[PDB]
Amino acid sequence: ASHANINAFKEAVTKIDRVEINRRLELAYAYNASIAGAPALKDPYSVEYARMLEVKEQIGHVIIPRINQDIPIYAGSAEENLQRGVGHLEGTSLPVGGESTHAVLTAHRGLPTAKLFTNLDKVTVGDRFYIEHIGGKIAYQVDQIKVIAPDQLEDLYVIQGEDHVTLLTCTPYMINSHRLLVRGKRIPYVEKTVQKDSKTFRQ
């Protein structure tokens, strides 16, 4: 079902005019610029703000090759969304990258019917993950892995001059008393070449 959703997003994007894509991206950049220029983030584990990015109800998908996950991203972190894929944390930057952006994406550390971010503990610094949105695919390299208590969101705010994405889930596995944050930093990337990115192959 999720992979069906991803295929739907992909096909749909191909049918969109490039000038149309670009206008919508500009809306997202502007949105992010307001966040960067400015709070009230709330832990999802106890919407239309991103409409410009939405295609087939999704704002894109996140790929994490080390653990072979490819999961659709939905705007907002309502439990309804977290039951079917990754949620984007409202109040954080939209996941299209850029100077002074920090997008936060979250998923359950396992559900009875879906692995989701179950194996996120196996990602190590230097591993890479990727976000495909309406404008193409961007890459991040993990630079920081952190465990925090549920009431600390300071790590989730924008860092001026920088381009980050944090993958947020609960930990330890089957306990979920804390939050695991796997953060990446933007790196240059162009898809569909002979490039191989695994840390094993690298560098």
Author numbering: 42 to 79, 86 to 93, 102 to 258
From the paper:
The crystal structures of GBS SrtC1 and SrtC2 from PI-1 were determined at 1.87-Å and 1.8-Å resolution, respectively. The refined model of GBS SrtC1 includes residues 42–263 for chain A and 43–246 for chain B. The refined model of SrtC2 includes residues 56–236; the first N-terminal residues 41–55, and the C-terminal residues 237–256, were not visible in the electron density maps. Although SrtC1 crystallized as a dimer in the asymmetric unit, the dimer interface is only 615 Å2, suggesting it is not physiologically relevant. Analytical size-exclusion chromatography under near physiological conditions (pH 7.5, 75 mM NaCl) indicated that both enzymes are monomeric in solution, even at high (0.5–1 mM) concentration. GBS SrtC1 shows an identical arrangement of the catalytic pocket except for the Thr rotamer and the replacement of Phe86 with Tyr92. The lid residues 39–44 and 53–60 of SrtC1, and 89–95 of SrtC2, could not be modeled due to a lack of electron density, while the conserved residues of the DPX motif were well ordered in both structures. Unlike SrtA, GBS sortase C enzymes contain an additional N-terminal extension, composed of one (SrtC2) or two (SrtC1) α helices and a lid that blocks access of substrates to the active site. For both GBS SrtC1 and SrtC2 structures, the lid overlapped the LPAT peptide that is covalently bound to the catalytic Cys in the catalytic pocket of S. aureus SrtA. In particular, the conserved motif DPY or DPF in the SrtC lids overlap with the LPAT peptide, with the proline in a similar position in both the lid and the peptide. These observations suggest that the conserved residues in the lid that interact with the active site of GBS sortases are pseudo-substrates, insofar as they mimic the binding of the LPXTG motif in the catalytic site. However, SrtC1 showed the highest Vmax value for BP mimicking peptide (4.44×10−2 µM s−1) while SrtC2 for the AP1 peptide (2.60×10−2 µM s−1).
